[PDB]
Each structure stands twice: as C-alpha cells, then as structure tokens.
Amino acid sequence: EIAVTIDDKNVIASVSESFHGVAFDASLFSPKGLWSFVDITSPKLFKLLEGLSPGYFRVGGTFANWLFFDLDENNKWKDYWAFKDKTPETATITRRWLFRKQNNLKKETFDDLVKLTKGSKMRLLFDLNAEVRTGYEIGKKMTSTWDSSEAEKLFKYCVSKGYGDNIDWELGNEPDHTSAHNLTEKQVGEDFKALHKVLEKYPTLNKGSLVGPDVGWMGVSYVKGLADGAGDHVTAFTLHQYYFDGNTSDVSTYLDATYFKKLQQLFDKVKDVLKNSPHKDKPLWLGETSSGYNSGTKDVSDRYVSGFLTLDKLGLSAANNVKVVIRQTIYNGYYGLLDKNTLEPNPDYWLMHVHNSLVGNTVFKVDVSDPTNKARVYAQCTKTNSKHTQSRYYKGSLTIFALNVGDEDVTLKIDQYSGKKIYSYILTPEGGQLTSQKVLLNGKELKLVSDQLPELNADESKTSFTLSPKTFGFFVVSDANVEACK
C-alpha cells in the first residue's frame, strides 16, 4: 500500500551510544529537599533505568535556577532579592521570575543520585544555577556576572567523595523565557566561558560533557550567543522542544501528523542561526523534550497514544544526527514515563525500552511515499549487544520502525528486502483503547516481576511490513546483512 526505499549504503547520522535520556525535573525539590513521594532509591527504579541504558539522567529545568546544594541558614544567597519574596520594587524587574526563594539539594540526595545513575549505567547531567550573579543594581545596572561559589561548593563535595566519572554539566535553562537577571545571549556565552575556567580547576569533574544553553525555538539566538562566547568549550548544544500545549490538547492532538514537521523546523532554525559559525556542525541534543508543554495532557500523555509522537521524535532526531533525546520526565507531570508513586511503567517507558533494545546508532535515510505523513518509517542498524539482542542478531541486521496514525491498515512495500527474515515487535494497547495505560508486545502485556524487566517476545510470523491503524512497532531484518552495519 505504501512505497518505501531505504538507502542502506550511505550513513546519514551516527547518534550517541547513550542515545536515550530521562529528565528528573528540578521542580521535585522544595526548601526542605525532595517532596516525600519522590523515589530515587528503589531497586525497581534501578532496573527500569538500566532498561534505557547506556543513557542520560538530567537533573534540571526552570527550577534549577533556585536550587542550592546543602542549603542552610548561612547560605550566601538567602538575603538576595531574586531568592526572597517578591516586593513592589522587584515585581516588575524580571523576565517571568517566580520568586520561589530557595530549594535544597541535600548531600544525601546528591549521593543517592550518583548511586542511582552509576547503578543504572546512566550519566548524571546536572543543571547548575545560572541566576547566582554579582554586579546587578535594581533600577540602575542591568549587567551581572555569574558567581561560581555555589557550583564550587558542589564541585568540592564531588571531589571529597570521588564523584565525577559519570557526571556531565549544563548551566541555566531557557534563559530567553525565564530569568531574574534578564540574561542576554552575550551573558550566557560569558557564563559558559567562566564555568569552563572553573571546571579546569577540577580535572576529575571536567572529563565528560559541558552542554547548553537548553533553549527551544524562540531562544535559538542563545545557541549562536553560546557558540560565539564559549563554543570551543561546549561539547553539544541542548535544545528543548514540545509540539503543542498539553493543557489544551486531547487524544486527537496526539494522533495529528501535522505536528511531526514542528521538530524538523526546530533543527532547521538551529542550523540557520549557526550558518556563519565554526560551530555549525556541533552535536545537537534534545536536552528536554516531550509532546505537550504545561506538564503534558492529564490521562492522555501517560497512555498508549503518547507513543506516536514519541516514536516519530526518536526517528526524526536520529535522522537529523541529533545525538541524545532526553525525555521530560522519568516521573511527575502527565508525561511521566513511570507513575510517580508506584514507579509502574507507562506505555512510553516500554516503547523507549524496546527502541533501546533493538535500535543502534548508525542511521539511514528512508524515502516513504505518503504525502499525508500518517505513516512514518525509520531504519537504523540493529543494536547487537542489548540483553535482548546479544547472540541473537549480528552486525548487518537492520532495525526498521514505523507508526501509522491513519485509520487504515498499511503495508510498507520495502522491495529491496523482499524474502529476508522479519522478526516483528508490535506494540498495541490492552483492551484496544488508545488511552490504555497497559501495552502489549505481540499480544503479550509488558510488565515487571520482583522488579525484573520482561524478556522481549519476538514474533517470527513475518511475511510483510504491516501496521494496523493507530499502531507502531519495530521490524528486525535479521539477515539484511547491511555493510555499513559491520
């Protein structure tokens, strides 16, 4: 029904081996530390994160700009206007600042995060506070300089504990959108230059990635500002992306293929802003991404139907040589991968785990004949070393994956592999309901067991590349014997 060509001869991208990531929002902290519901210690969580490994665990977001390591009564910043209650005098001087005062990142919570990420083969990507600044004068002096004293308190603690081998750093978050000090593109460049100079003093903490500036399409000027100011010291540019407002959306929004292209346009805008930069080919990460902003869509974005945009994003990012995709959030909000209380995995968790199991980092271009875009196809090399695929598929195997938001059955006519052996991994909702919170792999429900991931049951009843309406899945062409994959 649908014509599909895969150019399996030309590698268009090579993503990170650590392609998958999850975000742990800094809004999980309070002045007293984590909210009481937050679980970063259950064996269960270690097993679920391992299922997305090797990957990234991002601690960050808007609230990172009022998080304080080991907050006590003597803290340097406690008497500073941006970290006190709003006054008539400070009420109109900021860019959308929330005046939430100070949250506490406790020593033992930072210990637990290092333990969790090390334990799960995840890197800890920590979002440092950018709104601790000197030189500002209310109503007189707009300019202000990043003050590294807070970051160095955490760096000294890391060195004291022998932490660092799995820690990556970023600084601030969406400065274009929310900022006490109205940070400019030039200031963010200067901030990253200054952080890189500090990290030079902590060599055990400076071997991983320094990424920024964590902006979406309205803030791409800050990517250019960061490239100009500190580009020679930045590993990768972190981008943020959401297709729509989750709060005004419903089940139909999550099936709407007109949204797909929003992601491509973000990548095009970044390439354009960088067109006159030595850093035009700097790796891009999605450092914080989901379908709906404003915490997603209640009782929708934690359900099966979230999977369509989730899968399209994973394939289109990889096709654009975006190295890392960090999903907002591991839990909390309506777009959580897990239930925040039970850690029970939502359908998007299972979709990411299956993608992580079957999909390697070498990427090919897929030409698909469907001007409607209701059917989306991607092709990358089968991952050969996942607990699933180890000694099961071998280098040269191709993983094709696809989604179908149409209300028809589609057959992908992939002539060039006609007569090859197909292993199918088809994800459908329990009870046929798009809002199901339970997902079937080839008719079997995916679930844990004494906190163990279930074995993936491949379906060897091949024959064609077909999707039922409103489904997605992966097809491993075990004997594709693709040269680029060897």
Ligand SMILES: *[C@@H]1O[C@H](CO)[C@@H](O[C@@H]2O[C@H](CO)[C@@H](O)[C@H](O)[C@H]2NC(C)=O)[C@H](O)[C@H]1NC(C)=O
């Ligand atoms: C910092 O930026 C803001 C926004 O550009 C400036 O103006 C304020 O914007 C906020 C919301 O972001 C409004 O609620 C305020 O009423 C606006 N204030 C005005 C119009 O004065 C703000 O003046 C800027 N501050 C400095 C120091 O330049």
Ligand SMILES: *[C@@H]1O[C@H](CO)[C@@H](O[C@@H]2O[C@H](CO)[C@@H](O)[C@H](O)[C@H]2NC(C)=O)[C@H](O)[C@H]1NC(C)=O
């Ligand atoms: C859109 O936003 C509002 C919050 O501003 C959500 O309504 C809240 O839902 C929570 C439970 O998740 C309740 O505790 C609050 O009382 C609700 N507040 C209000 C003001 O209604 C709402 O669920 C969101 N809707 C969607 C579709 O995501």
